[PDB]
Amino acid sequence: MDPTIAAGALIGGGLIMAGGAIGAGIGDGVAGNALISGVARQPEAQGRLFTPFFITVGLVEAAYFINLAFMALFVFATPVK
Amino acid sequence: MVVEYVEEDIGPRTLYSFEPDATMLFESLLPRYLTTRVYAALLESAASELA
């Protein structure tokens, strides 16, 4: 009915956010691992490593927030009512 | 050889990277060190013989 569509939208948004969270969390983890290792090798490399690191994060979190946007589109402005 | 801990001389200094690791290089470099010392001994004894 209408509530069935609403429930489908809620579950779909949930899945989208879950995928986003897994992706962002593990991606930032695997990037920060390299950052910390580099800073453990050469301390004065820190100011340098913040350029590639934040590039990587800029990509990772990107996929996250895109999903976030679409989750809103699923939950609030649900395409099919 | 006797081992002689010299100093600290290690503050924010950057650590080295060894390939493949530390001990393999150490154990393939020690006989070369003894050979270098024997070579220096031969050279010094030659100069001394000429004096």
Can you describe this structure in just a few lines?
The structure is cut from a larger assembly and holds chains A (81 residues) and B (51 residues). Chain A has 81 residues and is mostly helical.
Give your account of this protein's structure:
This is part of a larger assembly, with chains A (81 residues) and B (51 residues). Chain A is an all-alpha fold and 81 residues long. Chain A is built from two helices and no strands. Chain A has helices spanning 2-41, 46-75. By secondary structure, chain B is an all-alpha fold. Chain B has one helix spanning 22-50. Chain B is elongated. The interface between A and B is small, with 4 and 4 residues. Chain B: This is ATP synthase gamma chain.
Topology:
This is part of a larger assembly, with chains A (81 residues) and B (51 residues).
Chain A: H1 2-41, H2 46-75
Helix pairs in contact in A: 1-2
Chain B: H1 22-50
PDB class: membrane protein
Keywords: Mycobacterium tuberculosis, cryo-EM, membrane protein
Entry title: Cryo-EM structure of Mycobacterium tuberculosis ATP synthase in the apo-form
Roughly what fraction of the amino acids of chain A lie in strands? under 5%
The main pleated sheet of chain A reads as:
none
Could you tell me the radius of gyration of chain B in angstroms?
Answer: 17 Å
Identify the overall geometry of chain A: rod-shaped
Helix count of chain A, per DSSP? 2
Largest sheet entry of chain B? none
Multimer state: part of a larger assembly
Helix content of chain A: over 70%
- Overall body shape of chain B: elongated
How many H/I helices of chain B?
Answer: 1
Following the backbone from N to C, one meets helices and strands of chain A in this order, namely HH
InterPro entries (chain A): ATP_synth_csu_bac/chlpt, ATP_synth_F0_csu, ATP_synth_F0_csu_DDCD_BS, ATP_synth_F0_csu_sf, ATPase_proteolipid_c-like_dom, F/V-ATP_Csub_sf
Membrane topology (chain A): Multi-pass membrane protein
Family (chain A): Belongs to the ATPase C chain family.
Main location (chain A): membrane
